[PDB]
């Protein structure tokens, strides 16, 4: 899939995009890449912080559907207005597929000032797309039309510019190293996976697995940090804090409050820990692990910023965990794919990991139920 590689672009802290098309003639627009959503919906009105947007006027084989969507969601809003029209991804499959379209007129906290993208792809499942499920996202639209196959990968490979591989319709085997690990999709909502140990050092913070799990974990890139639930994220960070004591920081940077820093060259990677999230594997009693380092979770702003935080919506496995691997979205067997990233950042001592199998009882008692 030569074609699709380094199709992803972005900036630090602000996402990863991919080049697509809309309307006849097609018009071109960047658009923000994310798994933790469901609708696909593009700037069509001339906010200032826009390099272009959606002109519905120009396109001939645009169709309304006279239809609004009003979209709050944790950190901002977007309303718009429904319609489908021709869409194609150019360094993608060769195809062009009759999507929905949310035509966004009004927002808040959406657009970033200094971005390079002017919309949002959702790529997780109808049960969360807007206004309710009868609007087919995307991905569902393109494989319901064409041949392409039910699944994509994401290589994301991280203001300094970042890039990665959006593979659609398969697996490119040069983006990752070992073998590929599969954890089951327990929803069809958002990507939601089951997390049954945590360790810190190889040190089990020996919670209750369902803590790990409260109310969800979920594979998002359209989220920055590792995000852990209040309870899980207190005990982590104490772990975390006592594993790094060689060195000590304020206690406001573990809260994200404020950044550390160090001269050029001389980040003491070896103080800081890696952490390992144990997924639920594909066989009974059996799981695998996967393991980032502090490259992955202090992230730059040499200083650098604390990239893990507290939730109220569950376990967030955003880019600090996309970074490390290679992610493929096997819709078509309900499974997600780590592997360890070819492109990671990491050091000559140590190396992020995806590794198996592990025995590990009681996996099904991990998930919360209301
Ligand atoms: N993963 C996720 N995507 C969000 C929030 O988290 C998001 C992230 C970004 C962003 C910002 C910075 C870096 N990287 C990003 F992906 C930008 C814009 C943005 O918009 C929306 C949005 F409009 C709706 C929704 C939802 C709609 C319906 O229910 C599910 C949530 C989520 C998001």
Not at 62 to 68: I, N, S
Request: hydrophobic share 40%; proline share 5%.
């Amino acid at each position: 899939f030569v074609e699709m590689v380094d199709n992803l672009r972005g900036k630090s802290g602000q996402g990863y995009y991919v080049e697509m098309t809309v309307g006849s003639p097609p018009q071109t627009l960047n658009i923000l890449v994310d798994t933790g959503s469901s609708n696909f919906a593009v700037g069509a009105a001339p906010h200032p912080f826009l390099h272009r947007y959606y002109q519905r006027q120009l396109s001939s084989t645009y169709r309304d559907l006279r239809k609004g969507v009003y979209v709050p969601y944790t950190q901002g809003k977007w309303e718009g207005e429904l319609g489908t029209d021709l869409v194609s991804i150019p360094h993608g499959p060769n195809v062009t597929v009759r999507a929905n379209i949310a035509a966004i007129t009004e927002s808040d906290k959406f657009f970033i000032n200094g971005s390079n993208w002017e919309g949002i792809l959702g790529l997780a499942y109808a049960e969360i797309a807007r206004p309710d499920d009868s609007l087919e996202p995307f991905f569902d639209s393109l494989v319901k039309q064409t041949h392409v196959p039910n699944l994509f990968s994401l290589q994301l490979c991280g203001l300094a510019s970042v890039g990665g591989s959006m593979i659609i319709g398969g697996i490119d085997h040069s983006l990752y190293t070992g073998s590929l690990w599969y954890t089951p999709i327990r929803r069809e909502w958002y990507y939601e996976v089951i997390i049954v140990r945590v360790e810190i050092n190889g040190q089990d913070l020996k919670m209750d697995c369902k803590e790990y799990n409260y109310d969800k974990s979920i594979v998002d890139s359209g989220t920055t940090n590792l995000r852990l639930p209040k309870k899980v994220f207190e005990a982590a960070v104490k772990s975390i804090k006592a594993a790094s004591s060689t060195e000590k920081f304020p206690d406001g940077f573990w809260l994200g409050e404020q950044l550390v820093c160090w001269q050029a060259g001389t980040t003491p990677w070896n103080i800081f820990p890696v952490i390992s999230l144990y997924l639920m594997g594909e066989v009974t009693n059996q799981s695998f692990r996967i393991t980032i380092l502090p490259q992955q979770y202090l992230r730059p702003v040499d200083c650098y910023k604390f990239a893990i935080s507290q939730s109220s919506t569950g376990t967030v496995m955003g880019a600090v965990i996309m970074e490390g691997f290679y992610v493929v979205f096997d819709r078509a067997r309900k499974r997600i794919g780590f592997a360890v990233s070819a492109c990671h950042v990491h050091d000559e001592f140590r190396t992020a990991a995806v590794e198996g199998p592990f025995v590990t009882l009681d996996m099904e008692d991990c998930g919360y139920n209301i």
